[PDB]
Structures are given as C-alpha cells and as structure tokens.
Short mmCIF file of N, CA, C and O in Angstrom, two decimals:
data_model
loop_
_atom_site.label_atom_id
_atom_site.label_comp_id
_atom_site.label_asym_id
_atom_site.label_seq_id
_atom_site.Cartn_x
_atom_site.Cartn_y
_atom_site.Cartn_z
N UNK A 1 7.25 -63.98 -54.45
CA UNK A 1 8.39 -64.87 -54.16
C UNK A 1 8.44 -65.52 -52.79
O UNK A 1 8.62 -66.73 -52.69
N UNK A 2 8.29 -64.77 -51.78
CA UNK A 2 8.12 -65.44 -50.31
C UNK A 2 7.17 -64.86 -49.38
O UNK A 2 7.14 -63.64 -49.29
N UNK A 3 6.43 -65.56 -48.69
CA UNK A 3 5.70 -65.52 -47.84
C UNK A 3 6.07 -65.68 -45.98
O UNK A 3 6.52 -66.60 -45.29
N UNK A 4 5.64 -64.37 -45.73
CA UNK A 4 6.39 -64.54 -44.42
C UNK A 4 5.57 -64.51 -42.99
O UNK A 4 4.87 -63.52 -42.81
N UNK A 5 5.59 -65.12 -42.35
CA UNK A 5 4.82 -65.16 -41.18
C UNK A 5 5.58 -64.76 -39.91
O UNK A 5 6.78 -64.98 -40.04
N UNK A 6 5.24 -64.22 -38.70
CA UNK A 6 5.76 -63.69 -37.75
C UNK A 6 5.41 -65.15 -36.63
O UNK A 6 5.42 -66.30 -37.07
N UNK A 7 5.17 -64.89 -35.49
CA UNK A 7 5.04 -65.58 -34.42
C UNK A 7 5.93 -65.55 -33.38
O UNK A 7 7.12 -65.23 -33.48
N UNK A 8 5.16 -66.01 -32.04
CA UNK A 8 6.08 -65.34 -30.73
C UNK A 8 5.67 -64.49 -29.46
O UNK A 8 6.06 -64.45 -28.30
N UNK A 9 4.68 -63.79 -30.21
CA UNK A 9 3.73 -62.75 -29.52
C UNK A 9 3.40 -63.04 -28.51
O UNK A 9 3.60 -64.19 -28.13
N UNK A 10 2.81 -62.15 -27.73
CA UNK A 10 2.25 -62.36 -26.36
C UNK A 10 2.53 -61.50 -25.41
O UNK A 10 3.23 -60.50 -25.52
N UNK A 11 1.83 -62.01 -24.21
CA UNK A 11 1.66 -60.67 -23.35
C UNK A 11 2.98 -60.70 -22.33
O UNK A 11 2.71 -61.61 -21.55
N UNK A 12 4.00 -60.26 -22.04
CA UNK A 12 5.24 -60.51 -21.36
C UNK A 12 4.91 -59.11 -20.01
O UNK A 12 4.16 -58.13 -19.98
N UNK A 13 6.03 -59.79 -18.96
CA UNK A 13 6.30 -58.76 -17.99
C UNK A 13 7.73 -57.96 -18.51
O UNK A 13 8.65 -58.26 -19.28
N UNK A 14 7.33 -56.53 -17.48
CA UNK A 14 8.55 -55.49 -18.08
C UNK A 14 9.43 -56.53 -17.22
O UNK A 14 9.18 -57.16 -16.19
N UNK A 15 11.00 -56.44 -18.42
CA UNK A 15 12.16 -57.54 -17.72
C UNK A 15 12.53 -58.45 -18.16
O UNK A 15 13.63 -58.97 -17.96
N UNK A 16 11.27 -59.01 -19.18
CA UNK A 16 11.44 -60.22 -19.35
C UNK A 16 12.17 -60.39 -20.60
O UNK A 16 12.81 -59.39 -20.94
N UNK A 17 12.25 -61.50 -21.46
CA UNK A 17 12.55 -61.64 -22.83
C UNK A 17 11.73 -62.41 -23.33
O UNK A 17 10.87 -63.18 -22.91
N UNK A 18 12.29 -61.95 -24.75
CA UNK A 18 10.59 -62.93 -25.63
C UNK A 18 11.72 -63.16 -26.89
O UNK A 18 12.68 -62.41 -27.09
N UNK A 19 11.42 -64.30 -27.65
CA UNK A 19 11.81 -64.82 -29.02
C UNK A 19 10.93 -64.56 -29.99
O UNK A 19 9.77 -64.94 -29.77
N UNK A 20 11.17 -64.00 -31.03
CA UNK A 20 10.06 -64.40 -32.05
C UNK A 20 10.46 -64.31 -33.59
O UNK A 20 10.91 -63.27 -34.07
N UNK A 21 10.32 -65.14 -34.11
CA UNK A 21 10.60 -65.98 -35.14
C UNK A 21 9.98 -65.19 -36.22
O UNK A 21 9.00 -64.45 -36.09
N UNK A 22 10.76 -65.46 -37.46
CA UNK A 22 10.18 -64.52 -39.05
C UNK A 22 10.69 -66.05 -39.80
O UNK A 22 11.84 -66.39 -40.07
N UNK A 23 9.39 -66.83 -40.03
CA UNK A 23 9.11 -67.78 -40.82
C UNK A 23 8.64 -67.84 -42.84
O UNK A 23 7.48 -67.74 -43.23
N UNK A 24 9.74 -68.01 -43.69
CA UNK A 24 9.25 -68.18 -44.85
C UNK A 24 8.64 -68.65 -45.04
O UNK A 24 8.11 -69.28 -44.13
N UNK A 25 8.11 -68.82 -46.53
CA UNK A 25 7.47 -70.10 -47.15
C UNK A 25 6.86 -70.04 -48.34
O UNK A 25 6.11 -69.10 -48.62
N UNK A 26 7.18 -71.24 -49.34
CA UNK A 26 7.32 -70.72 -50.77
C UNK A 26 8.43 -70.51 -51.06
O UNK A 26 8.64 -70.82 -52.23
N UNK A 27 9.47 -70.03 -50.44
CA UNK A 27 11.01 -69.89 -50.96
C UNK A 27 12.15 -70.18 -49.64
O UNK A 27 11.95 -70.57 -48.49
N UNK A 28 13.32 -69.83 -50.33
CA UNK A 28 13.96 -70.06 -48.82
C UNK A 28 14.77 -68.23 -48.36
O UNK A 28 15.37 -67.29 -48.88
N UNK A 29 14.36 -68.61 -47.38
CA UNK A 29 14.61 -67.19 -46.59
C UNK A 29 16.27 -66.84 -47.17
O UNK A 29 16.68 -65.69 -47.37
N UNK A 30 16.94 -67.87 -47.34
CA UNK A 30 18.40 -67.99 -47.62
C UNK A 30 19.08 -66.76 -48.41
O UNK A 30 19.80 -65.90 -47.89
N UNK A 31 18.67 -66.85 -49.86
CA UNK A 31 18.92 -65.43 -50.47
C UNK A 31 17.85 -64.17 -50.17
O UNK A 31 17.29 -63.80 -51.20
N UNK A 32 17.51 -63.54 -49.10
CA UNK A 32 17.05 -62.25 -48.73
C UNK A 32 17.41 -61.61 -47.61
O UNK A 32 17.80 -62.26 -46.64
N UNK A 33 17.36 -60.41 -47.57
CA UNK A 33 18.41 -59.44 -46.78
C UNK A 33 16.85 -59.55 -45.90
O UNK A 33 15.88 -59.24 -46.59
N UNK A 34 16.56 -59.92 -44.57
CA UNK A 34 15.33 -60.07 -43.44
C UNK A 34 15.41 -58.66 -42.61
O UNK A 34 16.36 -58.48 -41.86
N UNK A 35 14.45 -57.73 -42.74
CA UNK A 35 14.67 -56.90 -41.68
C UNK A 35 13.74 -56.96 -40.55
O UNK A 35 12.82 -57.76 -40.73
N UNK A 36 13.74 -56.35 -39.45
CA UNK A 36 12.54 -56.10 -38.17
C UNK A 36 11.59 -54.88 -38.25
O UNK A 36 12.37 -53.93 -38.35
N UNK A 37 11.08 -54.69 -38.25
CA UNK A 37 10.19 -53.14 -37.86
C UNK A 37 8.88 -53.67 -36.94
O UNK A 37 8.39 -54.79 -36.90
N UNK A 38 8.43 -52.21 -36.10
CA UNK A 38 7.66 -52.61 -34.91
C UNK A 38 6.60 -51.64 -35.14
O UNK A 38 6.79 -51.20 -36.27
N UNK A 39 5.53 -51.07 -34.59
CA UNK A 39 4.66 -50.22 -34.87
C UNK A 39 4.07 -50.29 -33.66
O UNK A 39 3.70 -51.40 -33.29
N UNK A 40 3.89 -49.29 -32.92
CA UNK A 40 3.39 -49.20 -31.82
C UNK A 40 1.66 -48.38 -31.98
O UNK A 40 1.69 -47.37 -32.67
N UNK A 41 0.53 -48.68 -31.52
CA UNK A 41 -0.78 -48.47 -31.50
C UNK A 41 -0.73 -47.15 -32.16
O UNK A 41 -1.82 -46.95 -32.69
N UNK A 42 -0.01 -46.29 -32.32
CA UNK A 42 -0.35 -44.57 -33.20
C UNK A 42 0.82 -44.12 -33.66
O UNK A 42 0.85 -42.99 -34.16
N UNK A 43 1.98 -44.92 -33.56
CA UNK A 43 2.92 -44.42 -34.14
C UNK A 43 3.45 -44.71 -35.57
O UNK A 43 2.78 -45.33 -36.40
N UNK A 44 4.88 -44.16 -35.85
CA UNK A 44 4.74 -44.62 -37.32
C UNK A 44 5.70 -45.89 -37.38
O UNK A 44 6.55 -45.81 -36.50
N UNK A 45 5.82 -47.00 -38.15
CA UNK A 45 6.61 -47.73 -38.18
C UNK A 45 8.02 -48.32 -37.96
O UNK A 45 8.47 -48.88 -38.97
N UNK A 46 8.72 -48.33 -36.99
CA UNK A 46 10.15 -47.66 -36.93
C UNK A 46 11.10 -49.39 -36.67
O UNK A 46 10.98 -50.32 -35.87
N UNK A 47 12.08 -49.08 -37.93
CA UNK A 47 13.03 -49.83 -38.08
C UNK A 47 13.99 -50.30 -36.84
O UNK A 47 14.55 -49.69 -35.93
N UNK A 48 13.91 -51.79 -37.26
CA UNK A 48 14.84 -52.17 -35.43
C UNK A 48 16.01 -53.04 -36.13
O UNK A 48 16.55 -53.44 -35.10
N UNK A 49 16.65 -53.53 -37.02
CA UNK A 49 17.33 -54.50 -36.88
C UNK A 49 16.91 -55.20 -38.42
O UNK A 49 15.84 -55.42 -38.98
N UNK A 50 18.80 -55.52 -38.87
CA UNK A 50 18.37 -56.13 -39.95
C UNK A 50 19.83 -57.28 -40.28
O UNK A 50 20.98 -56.89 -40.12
N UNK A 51 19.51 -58.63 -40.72
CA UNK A 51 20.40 -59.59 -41.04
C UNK A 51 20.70 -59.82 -42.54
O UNK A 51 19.77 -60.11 -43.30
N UNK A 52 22.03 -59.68 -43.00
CA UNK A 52 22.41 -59.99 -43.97
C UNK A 52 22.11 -61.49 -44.53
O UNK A 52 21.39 -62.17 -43.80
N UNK A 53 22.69 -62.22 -46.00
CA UNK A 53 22.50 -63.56 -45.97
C UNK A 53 23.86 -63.68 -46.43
O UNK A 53 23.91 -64.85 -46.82
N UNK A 54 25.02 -63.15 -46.62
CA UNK A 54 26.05 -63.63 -46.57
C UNK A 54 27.16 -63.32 -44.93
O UNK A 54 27.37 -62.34 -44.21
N UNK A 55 27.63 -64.81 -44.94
CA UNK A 55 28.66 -65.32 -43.86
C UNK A 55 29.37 -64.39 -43.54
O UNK A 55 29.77 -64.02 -44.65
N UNK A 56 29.98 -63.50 -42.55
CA UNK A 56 30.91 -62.68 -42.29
C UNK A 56 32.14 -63.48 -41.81
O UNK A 56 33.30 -63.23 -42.12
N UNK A 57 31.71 -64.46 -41.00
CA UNK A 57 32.73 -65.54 -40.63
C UNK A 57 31.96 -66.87 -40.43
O UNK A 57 30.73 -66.83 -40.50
N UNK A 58 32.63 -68.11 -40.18
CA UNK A 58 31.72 -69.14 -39.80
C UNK A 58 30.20 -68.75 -39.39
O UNK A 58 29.31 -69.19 -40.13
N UNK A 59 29.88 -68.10 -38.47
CA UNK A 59 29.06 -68.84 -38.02
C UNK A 59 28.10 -67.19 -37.63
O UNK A 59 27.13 -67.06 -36.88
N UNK A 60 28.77 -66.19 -38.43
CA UNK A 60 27.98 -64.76 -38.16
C UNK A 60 27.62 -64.29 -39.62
O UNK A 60 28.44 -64.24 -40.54
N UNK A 61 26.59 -64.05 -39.69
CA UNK A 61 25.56 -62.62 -40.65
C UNK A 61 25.53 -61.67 -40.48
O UNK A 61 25.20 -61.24 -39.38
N UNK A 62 25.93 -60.69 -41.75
CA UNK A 62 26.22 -59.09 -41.57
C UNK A 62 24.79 -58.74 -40.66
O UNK A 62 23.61 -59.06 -40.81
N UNK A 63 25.36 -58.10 -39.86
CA UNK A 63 23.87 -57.85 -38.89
C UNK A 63 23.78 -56.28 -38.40
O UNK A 63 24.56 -55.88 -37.53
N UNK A 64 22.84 -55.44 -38.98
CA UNK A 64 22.57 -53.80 -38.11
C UNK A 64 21.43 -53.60 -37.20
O UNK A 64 20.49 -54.39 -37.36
N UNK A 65 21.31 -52.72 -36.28
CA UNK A 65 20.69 -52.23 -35.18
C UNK A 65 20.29 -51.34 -35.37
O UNK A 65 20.67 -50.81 -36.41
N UNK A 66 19.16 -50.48 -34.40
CA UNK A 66 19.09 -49.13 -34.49
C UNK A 66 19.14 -48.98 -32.98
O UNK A 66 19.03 -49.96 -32.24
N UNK A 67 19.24 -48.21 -32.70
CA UNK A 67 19.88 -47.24 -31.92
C UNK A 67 19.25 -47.35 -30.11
O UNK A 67 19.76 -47.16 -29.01
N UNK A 68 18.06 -47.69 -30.56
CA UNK A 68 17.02 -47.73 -29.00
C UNK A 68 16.83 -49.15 -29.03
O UNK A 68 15.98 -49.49 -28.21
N UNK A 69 17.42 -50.35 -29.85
CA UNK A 69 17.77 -51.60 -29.28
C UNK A 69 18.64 -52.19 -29.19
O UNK A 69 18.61 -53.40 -28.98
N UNK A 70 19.88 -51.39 -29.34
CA UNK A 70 20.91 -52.21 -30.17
C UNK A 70 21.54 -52.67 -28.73
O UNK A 70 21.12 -51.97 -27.81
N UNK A 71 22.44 -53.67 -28.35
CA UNK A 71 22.54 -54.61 -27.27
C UNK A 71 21.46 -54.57 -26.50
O UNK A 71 21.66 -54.15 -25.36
N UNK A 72 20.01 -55.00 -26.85
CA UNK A 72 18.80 -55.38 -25.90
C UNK A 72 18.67 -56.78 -26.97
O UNK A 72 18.52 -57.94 -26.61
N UNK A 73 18.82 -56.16 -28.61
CA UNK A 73 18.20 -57.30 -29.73
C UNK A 73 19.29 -58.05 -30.10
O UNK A 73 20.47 -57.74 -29.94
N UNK A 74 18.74 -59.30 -30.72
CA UNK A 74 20.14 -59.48 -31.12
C UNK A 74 19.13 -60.74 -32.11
O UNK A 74 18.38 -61.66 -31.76
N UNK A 75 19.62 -60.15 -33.58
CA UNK A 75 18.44 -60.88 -34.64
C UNK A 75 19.91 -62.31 -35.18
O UNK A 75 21.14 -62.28 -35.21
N UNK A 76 18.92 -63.27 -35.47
CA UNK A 76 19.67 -64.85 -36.17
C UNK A 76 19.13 -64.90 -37.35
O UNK A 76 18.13 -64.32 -37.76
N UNK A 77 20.02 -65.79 -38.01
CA UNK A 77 19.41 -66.72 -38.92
C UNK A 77 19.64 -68.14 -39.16
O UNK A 77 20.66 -68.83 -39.08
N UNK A 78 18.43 -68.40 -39.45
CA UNK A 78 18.48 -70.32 -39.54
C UNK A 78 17.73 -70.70 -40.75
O UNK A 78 16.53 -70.97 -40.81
N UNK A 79 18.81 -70.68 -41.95
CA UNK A 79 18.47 -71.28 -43.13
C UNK A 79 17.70 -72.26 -42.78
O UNK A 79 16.48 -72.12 -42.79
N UNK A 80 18.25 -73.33 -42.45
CA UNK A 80 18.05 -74.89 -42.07
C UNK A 80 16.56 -74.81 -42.14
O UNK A 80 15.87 -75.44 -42.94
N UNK A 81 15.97 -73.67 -40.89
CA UNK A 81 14.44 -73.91 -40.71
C UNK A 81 13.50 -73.25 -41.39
O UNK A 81 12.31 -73.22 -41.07
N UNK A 82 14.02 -72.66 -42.38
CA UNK A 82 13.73 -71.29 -43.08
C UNK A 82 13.10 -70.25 -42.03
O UNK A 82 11.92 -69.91 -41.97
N UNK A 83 14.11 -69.83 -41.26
CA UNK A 83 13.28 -68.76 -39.97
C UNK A 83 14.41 -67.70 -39.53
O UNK A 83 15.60 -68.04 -39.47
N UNK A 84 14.21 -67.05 -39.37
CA UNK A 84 15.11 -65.41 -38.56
C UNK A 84 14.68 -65.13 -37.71
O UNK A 84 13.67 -64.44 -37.85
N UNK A 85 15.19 -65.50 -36.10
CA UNK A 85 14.71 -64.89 -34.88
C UNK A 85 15.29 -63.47 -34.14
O UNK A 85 16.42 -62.99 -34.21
N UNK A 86 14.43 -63.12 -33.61
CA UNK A 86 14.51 -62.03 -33.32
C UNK A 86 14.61 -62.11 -31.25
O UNK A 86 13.55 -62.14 -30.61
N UNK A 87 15.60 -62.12 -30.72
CA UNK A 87 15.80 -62.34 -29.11
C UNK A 87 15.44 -60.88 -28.49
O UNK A 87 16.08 -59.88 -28.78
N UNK A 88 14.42 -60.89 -27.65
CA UNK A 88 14.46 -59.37 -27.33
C UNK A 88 14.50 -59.47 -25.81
O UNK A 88 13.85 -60.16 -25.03
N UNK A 89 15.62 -58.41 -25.62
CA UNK A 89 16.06 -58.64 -23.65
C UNK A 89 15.54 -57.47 -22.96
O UNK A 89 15.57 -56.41 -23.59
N UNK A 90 15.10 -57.46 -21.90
CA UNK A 90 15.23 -56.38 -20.95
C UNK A 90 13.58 -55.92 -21.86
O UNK A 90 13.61 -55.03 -22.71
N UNK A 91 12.69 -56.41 -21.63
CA UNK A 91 11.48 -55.53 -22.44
C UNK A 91 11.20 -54.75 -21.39
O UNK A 91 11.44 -55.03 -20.22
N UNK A 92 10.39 -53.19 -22.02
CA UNK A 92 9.93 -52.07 -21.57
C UNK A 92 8.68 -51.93 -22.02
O UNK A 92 8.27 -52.56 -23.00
N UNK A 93 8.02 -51.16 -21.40
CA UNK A 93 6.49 -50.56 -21.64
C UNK A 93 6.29 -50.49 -22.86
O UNK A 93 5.44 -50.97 -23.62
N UNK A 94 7.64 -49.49 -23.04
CA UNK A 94 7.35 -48.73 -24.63
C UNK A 94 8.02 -49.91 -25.93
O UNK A 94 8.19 -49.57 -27.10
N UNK A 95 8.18 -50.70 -25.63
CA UNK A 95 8.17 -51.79 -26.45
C UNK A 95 7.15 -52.80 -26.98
O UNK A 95 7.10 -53.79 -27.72
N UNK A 96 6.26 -51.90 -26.11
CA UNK A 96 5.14 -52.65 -26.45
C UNK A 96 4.57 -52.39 -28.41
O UNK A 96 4.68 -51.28 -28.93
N UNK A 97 4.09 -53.46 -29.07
CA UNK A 97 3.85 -52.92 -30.63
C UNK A 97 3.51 -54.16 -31.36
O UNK A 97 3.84 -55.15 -30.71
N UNK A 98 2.99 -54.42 -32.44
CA UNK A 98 2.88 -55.23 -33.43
C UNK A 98 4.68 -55.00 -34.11
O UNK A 98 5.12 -53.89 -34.40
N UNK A 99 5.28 -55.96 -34.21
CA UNK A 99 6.42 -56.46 -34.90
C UNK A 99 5.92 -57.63 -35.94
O UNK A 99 5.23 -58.66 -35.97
N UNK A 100 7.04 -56.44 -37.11
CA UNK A 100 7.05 -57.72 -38.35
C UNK A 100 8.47 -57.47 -39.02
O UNK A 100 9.14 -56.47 -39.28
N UNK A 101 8.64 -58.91 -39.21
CA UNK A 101 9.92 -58.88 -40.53
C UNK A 101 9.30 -58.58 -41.68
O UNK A 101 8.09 -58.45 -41.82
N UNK A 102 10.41 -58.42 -42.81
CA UNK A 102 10.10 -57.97 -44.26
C UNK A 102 11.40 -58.53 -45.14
O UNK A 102 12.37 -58.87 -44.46
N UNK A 103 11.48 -58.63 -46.22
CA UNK A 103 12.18 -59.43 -47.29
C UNK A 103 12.82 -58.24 -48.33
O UNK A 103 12.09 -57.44 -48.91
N UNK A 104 14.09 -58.27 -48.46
CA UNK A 104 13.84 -57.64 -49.57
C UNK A 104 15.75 -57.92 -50.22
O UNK A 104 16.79 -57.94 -49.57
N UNK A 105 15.47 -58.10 -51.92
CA UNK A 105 16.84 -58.46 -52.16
C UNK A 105 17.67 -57.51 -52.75
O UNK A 105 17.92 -57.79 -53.92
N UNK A 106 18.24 -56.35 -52.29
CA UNK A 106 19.16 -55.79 -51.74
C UNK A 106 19.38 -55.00 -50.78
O UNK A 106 18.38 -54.53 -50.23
N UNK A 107 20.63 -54.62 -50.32
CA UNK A 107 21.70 -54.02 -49.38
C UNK A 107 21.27 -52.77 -49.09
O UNK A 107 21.24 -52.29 -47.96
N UNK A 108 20.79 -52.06 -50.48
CA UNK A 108 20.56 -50.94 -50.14
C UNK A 108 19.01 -50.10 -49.51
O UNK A 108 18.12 -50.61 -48.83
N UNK A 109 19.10 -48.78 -49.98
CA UNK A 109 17.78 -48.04 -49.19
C UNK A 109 18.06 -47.91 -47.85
O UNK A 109 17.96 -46.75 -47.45
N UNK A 110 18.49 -49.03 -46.71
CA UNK A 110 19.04 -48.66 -45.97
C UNK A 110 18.16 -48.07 -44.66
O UNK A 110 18.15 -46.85 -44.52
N UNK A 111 17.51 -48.81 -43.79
CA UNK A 111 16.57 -48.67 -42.37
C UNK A 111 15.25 -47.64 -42.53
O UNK A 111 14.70 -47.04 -41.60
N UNK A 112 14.92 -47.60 -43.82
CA UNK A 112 13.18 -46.98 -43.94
C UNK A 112 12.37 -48.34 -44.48
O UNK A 112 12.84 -49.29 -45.11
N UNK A 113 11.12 -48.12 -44.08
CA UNK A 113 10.41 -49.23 -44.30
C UNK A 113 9.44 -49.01 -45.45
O UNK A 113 8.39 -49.64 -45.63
N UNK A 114 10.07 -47.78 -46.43
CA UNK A 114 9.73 -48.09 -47.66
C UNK A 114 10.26 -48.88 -49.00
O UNK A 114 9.56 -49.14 -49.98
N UNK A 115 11.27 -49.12 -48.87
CA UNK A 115 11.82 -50.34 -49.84
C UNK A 115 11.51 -51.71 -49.51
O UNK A 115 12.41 -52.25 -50.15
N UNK A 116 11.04 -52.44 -49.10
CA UNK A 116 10.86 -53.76 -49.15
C UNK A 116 9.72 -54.89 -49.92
O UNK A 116 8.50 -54.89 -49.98
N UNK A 117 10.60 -55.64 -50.35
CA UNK A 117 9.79 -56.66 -51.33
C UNK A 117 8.23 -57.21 -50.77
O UNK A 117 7.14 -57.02 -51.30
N UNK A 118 8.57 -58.01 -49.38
CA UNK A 118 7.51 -59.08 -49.09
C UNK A 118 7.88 -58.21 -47.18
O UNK A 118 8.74 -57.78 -46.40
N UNK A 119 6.29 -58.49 -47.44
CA UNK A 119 6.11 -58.29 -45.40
C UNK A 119 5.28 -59.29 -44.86
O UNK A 119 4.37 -59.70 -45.58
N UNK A 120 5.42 -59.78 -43.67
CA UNK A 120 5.05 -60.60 -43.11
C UNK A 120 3.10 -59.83 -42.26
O UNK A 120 2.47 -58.80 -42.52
N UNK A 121 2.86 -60.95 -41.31
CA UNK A 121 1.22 -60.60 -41.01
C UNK A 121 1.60 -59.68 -39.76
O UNK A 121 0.69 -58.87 -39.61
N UNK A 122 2.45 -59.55 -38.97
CA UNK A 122 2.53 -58.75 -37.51
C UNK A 122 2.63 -59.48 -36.23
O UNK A 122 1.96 -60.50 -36.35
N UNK A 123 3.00 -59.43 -35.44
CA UNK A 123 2.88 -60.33 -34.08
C UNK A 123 2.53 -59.22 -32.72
O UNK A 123 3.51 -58.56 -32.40
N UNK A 124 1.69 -59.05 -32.18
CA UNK A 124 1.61 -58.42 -31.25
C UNK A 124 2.40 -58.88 -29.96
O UNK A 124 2.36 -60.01 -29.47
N UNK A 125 3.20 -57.70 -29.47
CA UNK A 125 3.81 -57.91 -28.09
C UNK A 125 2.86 -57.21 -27.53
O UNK A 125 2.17 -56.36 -28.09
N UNK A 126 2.80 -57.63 -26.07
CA UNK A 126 2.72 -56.36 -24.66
C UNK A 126 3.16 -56.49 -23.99
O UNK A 126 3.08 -57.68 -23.67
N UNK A 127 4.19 -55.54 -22.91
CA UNK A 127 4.64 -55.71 -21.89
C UNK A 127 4.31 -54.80 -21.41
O UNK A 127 4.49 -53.63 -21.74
N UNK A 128 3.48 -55.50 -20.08
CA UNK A 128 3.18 -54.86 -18.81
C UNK A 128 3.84 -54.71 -18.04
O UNK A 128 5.00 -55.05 -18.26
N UNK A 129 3.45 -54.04 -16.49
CA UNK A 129 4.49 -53.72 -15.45
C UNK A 129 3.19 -54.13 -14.55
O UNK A 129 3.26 -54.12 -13.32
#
C-alpha cells in the first residue's frame, strides 16, 4: 500500500537540531497512524514518537512520545506533501542511530515495533561532540 522513504540524515554537532522527513509514495500518508523508531549500531530498536491522522483541533494530530524524547521531539504532519517530520532538539551522543518511520492502520499494539504495516529505508544520524 505505501512506500516510505526517510531523509535528513547526517552528521550533526552535540546541540544542534536536525529535521527529517518520513516521505510516502504510492498512497497518501493521510489515512495511516506514522510512527518513529531509531536503532542505534547494537541495540534493539526503540520506539520514539508517533502521529495520529485524525484532527484533535484545527491545526493538531493526536501525537505520543516516549519518555527519553519527549519535549526534545516534536513529530508533524503534512498531508499536502505527503511527508511527517520529525524536529529533533538538543541532540546527544547517544542519539546517535539509523531512524525510520513506519505505517500502520490502527491505534492499537501501542509503542513496540512489532505491529507495523510498511517501514521505510533508515536515515543515519551522528552526533558528534
């Protein structure tokens, strides 16, 4: 059903911020619940952040966090471009990882990264010091 691509990556200083974008294609990102997950060089996959596709008010998407980003991230969505960005503030060492979004159409299962429909290719961060 959808095809998803990451992008954004790159090598950042600790401090800085980086954007990076979860691009459809083939469908519209519109009806799917978009989540984040990151994977760091030996670890296991760990859930960061996930956007609803229905309106909570004008101009907000039901939106959850986990716990070691939650006011650093702060994930969007932009039907319009078929894309979900992902703003990441204050980067750290240990943030360093391949990040990818994933697709999947429902609510539930709930921040493991074994339920999901469609996954995207990965984007490598690094942040140095």
């Amino acid at each position: 059903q959808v095809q998803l691509q990451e992008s954004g990556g790159g090598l950042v200083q600790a401090g800085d911020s980086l954007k990076l974008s979860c691009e459809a294609s083939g469908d519209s990102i519109g009806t799917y619940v978009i989540g984040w997950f990151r994977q760091a060089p030996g670890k296991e996959r760990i859930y960061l952040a996930t956007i609803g596709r229905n309106l909570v008010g004008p101009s907000d998407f039901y939106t959850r966090y986990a716990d070691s980003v939650k006011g650093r991230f702060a994930v969007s969505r932009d039907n319009a471009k078929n894309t979900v960005n992902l703003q990441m503030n204050s980067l750290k060492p240990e943030d360093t990882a391949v990040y990818y979004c994933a697709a999947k159409t429902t609510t539930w299962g709930g921040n493991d990264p074994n339920n999901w429909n469609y996954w995207g290719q990965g984007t490598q961060v690094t942040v140095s010091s």
